[PDB]
């Protein structure tokens, strides 16, 4: 069992930008989904070894997590609020690949995608 390396969450090349939607996506949208009791399972990347889950990443080739998404958020990582979306995406269709409809974790990432649209619904106008 061996974990990948966890996605980068800085890169001195990678051109970034300090937006208010970002600003919003870390302040509003990232710290309220965090503190839902269904958020826990998403806090850091997947441990495949200490979960017991040896086919993760068979499966899923590009991991994502909140934890990364809030250290890229904080590390000023983004250029805009679509790249930090498109993160937070991943994170839920890799949910919905490796598992099965109604599974725990599944019935988890779908309240929480579900918060998640309801947030970016209406952003903050880039000022
Ligand atoms: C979101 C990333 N991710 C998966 O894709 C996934 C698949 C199966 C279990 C599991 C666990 S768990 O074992 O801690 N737990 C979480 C709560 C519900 C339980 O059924 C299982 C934590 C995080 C996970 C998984």
């Given at each position: 069992?061996?974990?990948?390396?966890?996605?980068?969450?800085?890169?001195?090349?990678?051109?970034?930008?300090?937006?208010?939607?970002?600003?919003?996506?870390?302040?509003?949208?990232?710290?309220?989904?965090?503190?839902?009791?269904?958020?826990?399972?998403?806090?850091?990347?997947?441990?495949?070894?200490?979960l017991?889950?040896?086919?993760?990443?068979?499966?899923?080739?590009?991991?994502?997590?909140?934890?990364?998404?809030?250290?890229?958020?904080?590390?000023?990582?983004?250029?805009?609020?679509?790249?930090?979306?498109?993160?937070?995406?991943?994170?839920f269709?890799?949910?919905?690949?490796?598992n099965?409809?109604?599974?725990?974790?599944?019935?988890?990432?779908?309240?929480?995608?579900?918060?998640?649209?309801?947030?970016?619904?209406?952003?903050?106008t880039?000022?």
């Amino acid at each position: 069992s061996m974990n990948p390396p966890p996605p980068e969450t800085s890169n001195p090349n990678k051109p970034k930008r300090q937006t208010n939607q970002l600003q919003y996506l870390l302040r509003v949208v990232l710290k309220t989904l965090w503190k839902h009791q269904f958020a826990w399972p998403f806090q850091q990347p997947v441990d495949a070894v200490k979960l017991n889950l040896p086919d993760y990443y068979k499966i899923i080739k590009t991991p994502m997590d909140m934890g990364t998404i809030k250290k890229r958020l904080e590390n000023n990582y983004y250029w805009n609020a679509q790249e930090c979306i498109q993160d937070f995406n991943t994170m839920f269709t890799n949910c919905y690949i490796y598992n099965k409809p109604g599974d725990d974790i599944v019935l988890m990432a779908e309240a929480l995608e579900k918060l998640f649209l309801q947030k970016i619904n209406e952003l903050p106008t880039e000022e």
